[PDB]
Amino acid sequence: ETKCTLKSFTVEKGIYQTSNFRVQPTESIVRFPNITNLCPFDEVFNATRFASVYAWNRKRISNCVADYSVLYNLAPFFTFKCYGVSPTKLNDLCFTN
Amino acid sequence: FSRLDPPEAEVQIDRLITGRLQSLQTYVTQQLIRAAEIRASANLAATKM
Ligand SMILES: *[C@@H]1O[C@H](CO)[C@@H](O[C@@H]2O[C@H](CO)[C@@H](O)[C@H](O)[C@H]2NC(C)=O)[C@H](O)[C@H]1NC(C)=O
Numbered sequence: 001e002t003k004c005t006l007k008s009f010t011v012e013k014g015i016y017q018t019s020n021f022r023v024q025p026t027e028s029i030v031r032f033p034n035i036t037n038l039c040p041f042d043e044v045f046n047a048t049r050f051a052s053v054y055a056w057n058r059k060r061i062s063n064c065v066a067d068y069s070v071l072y073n074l075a076p077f078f079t080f081k082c083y084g085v086s087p088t089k090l091n092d093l094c095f096t097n
Numbered sequence: 098f099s100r101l102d103p104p105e106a107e108v109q110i111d112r113l114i115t116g117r118l119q120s121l122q123t124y125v126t127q128q129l130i131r132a133a134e135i136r137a138s139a140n141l142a143a144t145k146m
């Protein structure tokens with residue numbers, strides 16, 4: 001690799017800068033917190049009546065599991081137009097408030 | 098890379114790579130001028146000793 005970095009075949013006497021050494025990872029750990037419970041997403045999407053525009057409904061959601069599998073199955077494909085995040089990464093990133 | 102999908106991530110990460118490149122060219126460019134002032138004084142110390 002000294003011959004590779006000088007682009008030659010007969011390197012001269014001296015000191016060179018070949019590359020750098022990185023300690024590689026050994027294993028992997030995934031430790032999001034110990035919480036488990038089915039989410040109230042079924043009320044907000046399968047509600048019979050929604051509120052009007054001028055007085056729109058309020059919902060607080062907490063202590064769930066963020067399952068985003070039934071979203072594509074309740075209705076056919078339509079727009080998402082998702083700004084902060086891509087729509088397909090929602091499960092991995094985890095959610096705050 | 099965790100939030101957005103791969104296609105537009107490039108647009109966003111291209112700004113940071115090009116931003117940090119010109120943020121690091123300015124380091125090298127200013128180092129080459131400071132070393133041209135030290136060498137103007139190292140050659141003045143060598144002709145003073
Ligand atoms: C609203 O209700 C519908 C059915 O009444 C739910 O649709 C099914 O949900 C299950 C739950 O895992 C899925 O496995 C099915 O694939 C869904 N089928 C269809 C045709 O959508 C829907 O999930 C409910 N809404 C929410 C937010 O849970």
Ligand SMILES: *[C@@H]1O[C@H](CO)[C@@H](O)[C@H](O)[C@H]1NC(C)=O
Pocket residue numbers: 034
């Ligand atoms: C998670 O919480 C429950 C109750 O809050 C508890 O019984 C369980 O031991 C916890 N899990 C771990 C790994 O400590």
